[model samples]
Target: STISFITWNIDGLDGCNLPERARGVCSCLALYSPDVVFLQEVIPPYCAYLKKRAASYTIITGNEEGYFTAILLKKGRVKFKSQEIIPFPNTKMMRNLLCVNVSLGGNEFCLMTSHLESTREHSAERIRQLKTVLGKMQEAPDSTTVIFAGDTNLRDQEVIKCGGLPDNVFDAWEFLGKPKHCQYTWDTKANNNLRIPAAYKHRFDRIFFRAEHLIPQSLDLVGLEKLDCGRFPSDHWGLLCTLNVV
Candidate 1:
């Protein structure tokens, strides 16, 4: 069976017409109908909108205060097993890893998400959080598929310097031959949610998976269209992925 997964930093930190923006995000979700959805930058008020609108999925919150991350699972296709929140002790921002263990299509899955440390200046902390994420992924039992995806905020050099990914896990985009059409997830040129013009673009969002029972099949960018209010869903584009269970 095939599965749909999405990871997006919904930009809940931005308050400009947030109510409408949340609706726009929900609309995109309705269309994609992903089995598992990972979200970042979720403020309290923004989550309320999601709770009210996206009722078909079970919501898991990472942190209570400040902007945090979350995970959503479609009730029809995913099972709610358990949850774990891993804290980044060195993080200056309220960043942590939100994880869940679930079953879908008769296979056990370990799902993880985070926003990581933001901005280029905090690369050191960002790398620290990444190391932690990789460690957790490595610790998972080989029988379960592990998916760690979200706003990594990581530059290419950082991943290179950290000795790259472990032997078992692989980045979804690169594994799919780095498709040119959806290469950049945080492209200022393409994403107009901020309403400010910038020349910079980066692949800030990523999906890393260790699949013992399932295999990564495809990847694409989401949240590209504008709402009626002429605003995109978030400053960061979502990574939509598809995989199949063997």
Candidate 2:
């Protein structure tokens, strides 16, 4: 069986602090209709709205009260096994990841959602969260395929070069011929005159897949161009992928 999933970091939907980006993303989802969606910075009430509007979806959000990562699966499609909302080692309100185990066509796999901290001060905490996520991946079945996605919040290639991706995980974009359309998935024409370099557009958004026995069909960055509603959904764009379940 094959499945498609979308992962994105929508700063906030409510327009309370962030602009109405969340609704824009929701509207996009309503049009795209991917089977599953992996999201970050999702407010609880907006999540409820997504649940209601996207009636074909079932959501699993991080247990935190306000903003956190979330996973949404298509209803009546896959058999969900469990949902795990992981907090940092010592933090109370900061939730880092939401891992979901699902059965599609009788095959079980994990879909892990995460939104790593942006500042250098939170670097260590972000690394800890990554380690914890890797640990959780160990619990899945031996034959299980794993897909990890969301905003890492790191722009510096030096930082990313030294931190993640060197481990067992494979970056989908790089593996998919590293398309020439520039890697930056965030910050397009900010502050009026601040013409951000497209090549170095801060690729904080990503989708990763384990290369063991899993089959990867495609991986891409979506919503790069501004829509008719004006402005891309959020500061970051969406990452999409298709995988074959054995």
Candidate 3:
């Protein structure tokens, strides 16, 4: 079976026109109808909105208060098994790894999502978080397809300093031919939801996976719509990818 997924940093920190912006996100979810979705910067209010609007999916969260990450599974597509919350004890942003084990079309899979330390000033701590994520991916049984996607709050240079992704793991975008148009997931030039003036952009949102039997089919961006209020769903574009068993 082919699985479609989306990972988005919904910018829950920006409260201006929040409910409307959330509707924009939900609208995209309706259009894509992805099998799984990972979201970062989720606040309690945002969670409640999704819970009410997207009844077709099951929600798993990393934190209940403040902001955190969340995972949504299409109820009939993914078979939920168990879940774990791995902590980054050194994180100053209250960050932690949230993972779920599931069976999809008879194959065991471990899906993880996290919002790593934010900003250039926290590079050291962010790289440490990256190491923890890689370690979890490495320690998992080889038989399971492990996929981690989220707002990593990382830059290409930082990844290189962390020794890069292991041989077994693949960057989904790089593996998918690295389409230039979809390269920048966070672009202040395009997304004006935050109203911060700058031309800066980054591939802050990403997907990494180690799957022996799955082949990536497509990679693209989401939340490109500008609402009537002249803002996007979030300050970052969402990533959409499709994968099939090989």
Global Cα lDDT for candidate 3: 0.91
Clashing pairs in 3: none
- Candidate 1 segments whose C-alpha is farther than 4 A from its true place: none
lDDT of 1 by residue, 11-41 (tens): 9988887898889889889999999999999
- Total clashing residue pairs per candidate? 0, 0, 0
Q: Which should have the higher TM-score, number 1 or number 2?
A: 1
Better of 2 and 3 by lDDT: 3
The residue-by-residue lDDT of candidate 2 on 1-246, one tens digit each, is 788888888766335423345556777777667778998878877777677676778888876477888888887877799877766665444767788988766666688988876666766666666666667665566688777887777655534565556466777777776764536666555411123555335777777766465666777666555544455667677777776655
lDDT of 2: 0.70
Candidate 3, superposed: residue stretches over 4 Å from native = none
TM-score of each model, in listed order:
0.97, 0.83, 0.97
Tell how far residue 69 is off in model 1, in angstroms. Answer: 0.6
lDDT of 3 by residue, 97-198 (tens): 999999888889899999999989999888889889989988789899999999999975788776778898899999889899889999988878766787
